[PDB]
Paper text:
Using an X-ray free electron laser (XFEL), we have previously determined room-temperature (RT) serial femtosecond crystallography ([name]) structures of the ferric and Compound I redox states of [name],26 a B-type member of the dye-decolorizing peroxidase (DyP) family. Such an approach results in “pristine” [name] structures that do not exhibit the effects of X-ray-generated radiation damage. The RT-[name] [name] ferric and Compound I structures revealed that the distal heme pocket, which is composed of an Asp–Arg–Asn triad, was void of H2O molecules. [name], therefore, represents an exemplar of a His–heme-ligated peroxidase in which the distal heme pocket favors a dry site. By disrupting the distal heme pocket Asp–Asn–Arg triad in [name], our RT-[name] structures reveal that a wet site can be formed.
To assess whether disruption of the Asp–Arg–Asn triad in [name] leads to a wet distal heme pocket, microcrystals of each variant in the Fe(III)–heme state were produced and subjected to RT-[name] crystallography using a high viscosity extruder sample delivery system at the SACLA XFEL beamline BL2 EH3. For all variants, well-defined electron density peaks were present in the distal heme pocket, consistent with the presence of resident H2O molecules. In the [name]/[name] variant, H2O molecules are in identical spatial positions to the [name] variant, indicating that in the absence of the Asp–Asn dyad. the preferred spatial arrangement of the resident H2O molecules is the space vacated by the Asp152 side chain. In the [name], [name]/[name], and R243 variants, w1 is positioned close enough to the heme–Fe(III) to be a bonding interaction (average Fe(III)–OH2 distances within the [name] hexamer assembly of 2.52, 2.83, and 2.28 Å, respectively). For the [name] variant, k1H aligns with values for the wild type (WT) and the [name] variant, with the double variant being an order of magnitude lower. Notably, the pH dependence of the double variant shows that the rates measured are an order of magnitude less than the single variants while still retaining linear dependencies on [H2O2]. These results indicate that the on-rate for H2O2 binding to Fe(III)–heme is much lower in the double variant, but the bound H2O2 behaves the same as in the single variants. The H2O network is identical in the double and [name] variant structures, so the reason for this lower rate constant of H2O2 binding must be a consequence of removing (or disrupting) the Asp–Asn dyad.
Residue numbers in the entry:
A (entry chain E), B (entry chain B), C (entry chain C), D (entry chain A): 7 to 312
E (entry chain D): 8 to 311
F (entry chain F): 7 to 313
Write the structure that this text describes.
């Protein structure tokens, strides 16, 4: 088999997301760092095992792919598509390389980002840096448990990893990132029961609302999607709270992994464009997207053989 | 028996430092929050015990003291004094209120900061916000172990807490804060042995250099101070690394606690102004101060009664 | 000078409460066990240290005291007083001996209870046995954080331990126990905001309601009491959830420790008999008392002396 | 593949065993709960991961199966078979549904039991509820280590999961439960060496007795069984201590999982009816069975597609 | 005065180092003594809070007179040999003791390495033992070890020199003996017979009742009452050690007390017996091959 | 397919290495103990789960194999080959049985060793006994992080376990042991930068030196080897510090596992005999080998199905 990157990670309480663009002439410096990134992860993380749980997933954008590599393109790799809905917009922002860094502690994420950015100085321009923290009981910036219905084990592997549909790229995945800022004032003005109707779960106990009470425009209803077979279409998410209390900046950095970008893009269309029964996802009345990018995260042996 | 604030804390791997100025007319809102800050600490932290280890130490500046309170001033409270050395300068920057927030996780620091700044909205202007992280083996941004020679137990209590010398304020302490930015490139250009001559301890094993090889201008030599009786004068320090890899900002946020600011100010004079044997602390050839402020952290019962 | 029992314990996730009456002729068997109870605690607990945190607090009722001992009575020892309110009743039930057994695991509590009851077979009749468990985020059976405003450190010692006011019994405490069963159907019919008006704290974040919106008949308002000097009167509580899902028994086992029973009894009078502004504690509309007893927990050296 | 339920769980120190009958007319409410039980397990357990280790195994009895489902039946599903031995009896008691709930803390077990029974109120009658706790060194109520010779990994999967011998029910297992009470007075009247001859292993070190000293009527000799091919026949056991010190109730709740009930029933016949060499298992001279039931635990996809 | 870390948290690992001071080694020794506390902080700090590293430094009677002028601690004298009818407590040489404890052997070894590095060419090693506790606090005989140690203020009153010897307040006396066990003979006894040797139940660690506890059980003989009828207590941290290949199965005994009189009265009852007991039955399965006595000064004494 | 022994273990901070020779006539006692070693592991270890992480890997030497078992030999089992280099020697020392015992605590390793040796008394003679401890940040006796480039997961299983190339022994592995003593005085006389040119990685941060600076005779350059297709050949290491401060004994006990002894023996030839670019591994100028032995660690089912 090919060795995937650590897409399927254990639960982690800390993350750094780095998005960067490749300057004129930066290609060779980038290809060098890509062939070393797995060995840098071992160097920073190994001495802190078993508690550190440090990992890095590397993604490459559509335009960056053609600057870096000759030969085939992964069949689903394209630039993020903007959605201009009746009320809400999903923007596209620039990005060539993503580093999704996770661990039990921010300091280990920081030490790996420092070695990666040290090797790229003068080849890349930073577009975004986010220092994520999960709340001690797995809660998100809105006060709800985050991750409950993610797939696990073999269902997670089937949902996330490219297979025989695109054999040269088996063991890869597609990552969509969006930085959201929340209107926390408007959100905390709702009763808990009104917040539960926005999400589609109980806030304190995390039990799903039944199909007879769950509104059509609740976040859980709109991100539930069935294929032609009537099989559930799933993705793997690891969204992280972030912010600054001084600047009144309270955010969710969304990341979702899927075997094909079509599943994530169908969920975004239902959220932003609505359906027959729902104008839009109620969660977008409290959350504004300010970034949007799409990346292919190759199998680790692809990056190693550079 | 006055109750000190949690100046003497267990080791913590995460911190938020908040420094704000009090807007004109903000006095009443500030005095209200001060009388509730201990109950806010309990509310956010209690449900995360015993691993959270959340605490908040609240400091008040010299000029803020006069706007907030009638009656006595603590004997040692004055504005931070600028040091204009031949090569290096310790700047004085504005601050009325300090919140030193510590825990095992950044998310807990953030939830308490969020409730404090919620209560002060419209009454204060943010001057500094720093999210600190300690490395997993107690190392700082320069790669050295940080905290080793801090006093513990009764020696710590005698070094840090105001007593019979100023009985109205017994159980208070004085805090000095300074934000440093490092020249990491210049630092990593030194051999380990040359780094050890700058600090005055072995890098890997944390053993102090013997008095016959320790340079007079090493950091440990200059911050070792004896009183008139020939006793060691100690302070309690809890400096944290911080940074942004995107902006190439690699920093140490210094905080020192002492029973009287004279001990901390004598250390700063030796570091910046030098002695007969040393022009300046060699650590300042790799570290620039961009803030400097001084605060009195009163006994907890003082804040509770106002 | 006297050694208190482990009244001030570290947080524990498991407990057993054993209340027994002394059969006629049981006196000598009981006095023998009381002089050995500390050595049994060490025998069961030592091999699980330091994580086990096994402790047993032993209490003696007013009528039992007179059967067991000649000489002085603790000044405040009397039988629990029944409270006959217009709507709610605090019943008095028999109890000669209390064993308050706490640890990080149920199995350790059970092994010490097994040795204690082994020594007392044929000298005592069991009146109550409760196996308590804490929820993983310090929540009680109603879904609220329990323990938040307990006193700590020196304020805990001052609030709980008998001193110079009763010198022969210094290092003792008084314990009040009540078993409550909840109407969980009626409780879960309230909105979260209506539950918050019953307790007097926010449910998810545990922040106290501000003094102008906290109802006078909320639980927190009625159990806040000021002495003549204007000081807060405090007790130390370690209440535990318990239950059987099959019998629909959802309960709180209340225990409160105080230096004098007057403080605990003033809180119970406000809850059950009301004030000018509150007919009764709203928590009693969802909580029925089915036991009530009062015990003196002597200094450890008092039990050893026998 | 079919997905099995969590029959092969990690070690857990807490359990709840719930056995109910289905009331007349209750069928529809039960089939609803069965299709939701996995979603309830994720909802209660997710926020405690990865330490919580919460899992629920659902079993259905022979008579209940015929009330709930039409069509083909698991080949081995029948009501528990009573064993009337010369001295000892294995009773059959009523049970239609089993919930085997396991976690690292009792409170997590209790919260999932509460949500299961909340959905079944008015459709089922409780027959048995046991709160199990393991001793801190894996010991049982007799003072011996319990679980040592359980199969692990692939040998465990082969021992427990239905395969090609019953292809419509692949991924299922058969569970036998028995609640035992011990005569602890009679037991503790044996020497350690006499206790070792009852079990067939050393008490302090858990080393199996040599084939030259292991008695024919020791527990390990009688539950050791070889098939016609000379392979070991294994089951997976997760027996838990339970009891009440006040009632002098000291028990073991036995559960055994096997791919066919023939293996568990051959072990029970040797224990209760004896063999050529042994009248009965000596463990039954200190252990009385007061319940006995048999359940089929289907693959998880069976329960989901209801 | 600040005591050394005599009263430590429970630890699962220890190194015991006993050395003699070579002629001319005195100055090198006095230099290392004034730095041992800063070496403990250096090695241990970065491994907090799990490390639990401490070093207790002791000085023998003969070594005291070579190192220091002025007062002697009142109770400091050479370990006394006990020539009993059946069992012997030997006296073996020892000038300096380092009792190193932590959660992990590697931390003990790193501190030992820095101490012995500073003393190279000034000292000769007499004994080095790497100790390990079993996961349920059991010792080499299979019994729970440490159960009756005093705690808190009763421990401080039992262990630390006070007003009776004010120049040395905050010090303690340490007695060490290395024991080797006859494990074959021991495992030949029934559990019940082992319980009569110790005076405690093996599985549950409950003390035997006063009507069944033999007079020559280990717990009966090491129970000693003062004139007022109070228990005289010591603090013990004995550790298992061994080599499986050389069939060496041992207990390294260390006991701390405010005066050596308490520890020496217990050793006289064990080895010489009384009217009621020939000797401690534990000595029929345990041979002492070292014996030494040290004063562990207050930490401020080592600093000055 | 079959059950391997616990060759691929979780990280462990404590280990006991026991090497013994089988006395004449000891064969039957040895074969008895081999069929019980897995049940002895369960007995001592189960009650300490989940923290104990106790395991035992049992190895059999080439000459012991012939005395114990009458059928086929594993294809690669032979006595350790001595390497007589210009400067440095890798000696071959006697050993018939290896017990590689690992856990989170030394006491658990010691209790299993005690039960194993109890069953073997009078049938075997002890040749080596080492009580190993790892430093709290995975560092070795030289102060460098040890284990960093070990393979993990499926790459580890492919590197270590016998498969279709030798089907009767599938799920087995080959273990090489060497006890090294260090010259710590000579080592601590080097600058940190000079230590880094000996190893080939940075001491504080464990980052590999660039291909532009990494010397030909650094330890990392010489133990990197590519097969004919240009794939890396890998082994799995679990080397442990050991010592006695009194005797000035500071050591590393090396153990390496591989699917074929040819990978480990090629690395040892480059270290001790050198190449075109390097006379010898610079690590050997501060490390002397005092033992060397080779063992086959069979599949667990092989030990169990015995007599
Ligand atoms: C804008 C900020 C967002 C927040 C705060 C948020 C929050 C949540 C929460 C609380 C849940 C329920 C617990 C869980 O299953 O994790 C959830 C579920 C989910 N979210 Fe989001 N979400 C956000 C954005 C998105 C986006 C952008 C997507 C996909 C494009 C998405 C897809 C999902 C999916 C697929 C589920 C699982 C649905 C199910 O139960 O089947 N979410 N989210
Ligand atoms: C660049 C900013 C700073 C860095 C990176 C730094 C770093 C360190 C380090 C690595 C040590 C040795 C380990 C320890 O005992 O903590 C130390 C010691 C110390 N530092 Fe700093 N320091 C900084 C600024 C300051 C300032 C501004 C002062 C005082 C005004 C100070 C006071 C001390 C003192 C008192 C010691 C203890 C020395 C002793 O008695 O051994 N440091 N510092
Ligand atoms: C081979 C050497 C030794 C072994 C294996 C050993 C073992 C034990 C054990 C298992 C206990 C009972 C539980 C507890 O720790 O309280 C005990 C108690 C004790 N031992 Fe020892 N011991 C040894 C040597 C010594 C020596 C030489 C002394 C005194 C000089 C001593 C003094 C004590 C004392 C005072 C107690 C507590 C007595 C009490 O219950 O008041 N031990 N020992
Ligand atoms: C004194 C003995 C030794 C010491 C102190 C030592 C130390 C080291 C160190 C510190 C590393 C780097 C980090 C890592 O991957 O672990 C390493 C790597 C390595 N050592 Fe050793 N080692 C020793 C002996 C040996 C021997 C005898 C072999 C093989 C016969 C060996 C094979 C390796 C290999 C294959 C690597 C990984 C290199 C790579 O591909 O990056 N070592 N060793
Ligand atoms: Mg009975």
């Amino acid at each position: 088999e090919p060795e995937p990157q650590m897409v399927l990670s254990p639960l982690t309480s800390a993350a750094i997301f780095l998005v960067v663009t490749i300057d004129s002439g930066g290609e060779d410096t980038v290809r060098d760092l890509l062939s070393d990134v797995a060995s840098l992860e071992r160097a920073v993380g190994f001495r802190a095992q078993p508690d550190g749980r440090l990992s890095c997933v590397t993604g490459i954008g559509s335009e960056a792919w053609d600057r870096l590599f000759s030969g085939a393109r992964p069949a689903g790799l394209h630039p993020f598509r903007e959605l201009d809905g009746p009320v809400h917009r999903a923007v596209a922002t620039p990005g060539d390389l993503l580093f999704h860094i996770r661990a039990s502690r921010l300091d280990l994420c920081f030490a790996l980002a420092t070695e990666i950015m040290g090797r790229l100085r003068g080849a890349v321009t930073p577009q975004d840096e986010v220092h994520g923290f999960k709340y001690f009981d797995e809660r998100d910036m809105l006060g709800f448990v985050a991750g409950t219905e993610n797939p696990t084990g073999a269902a997670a592997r089937r949902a996330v990893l490219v297979g025989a549909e695109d054999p040269a790229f088996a063991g890869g995945s597609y990552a969509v990132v969006q930085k959201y800022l929340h209107d926390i004032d408007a959100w905390e003005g709702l009763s808990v029961e009104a917040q539960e109707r926005v999400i589609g779960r109980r806030k304190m106990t995390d039990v799903e609302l039944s199909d007879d009470v769950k509104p059509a425009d609740s976040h859980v209803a709109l991100t539930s999607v069935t294929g032609p077979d009537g099989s559930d279409l799933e993705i793997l998410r690891d969204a992280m709270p972030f912010g600054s209390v001084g600047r009144e900046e309270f955010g969710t950095y969304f990341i979702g992994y899927a075997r094909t970008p079509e599943v994530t893009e169908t969920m975004l269309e239902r959220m932003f464009l609505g359906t027959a029964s729902a104008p839009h996802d109620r969660i977008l009345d409290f959350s504004t997207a300010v970034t949007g990018s799409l990346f292919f995260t190759p199998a680790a042996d692809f990056l190693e053989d550079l």
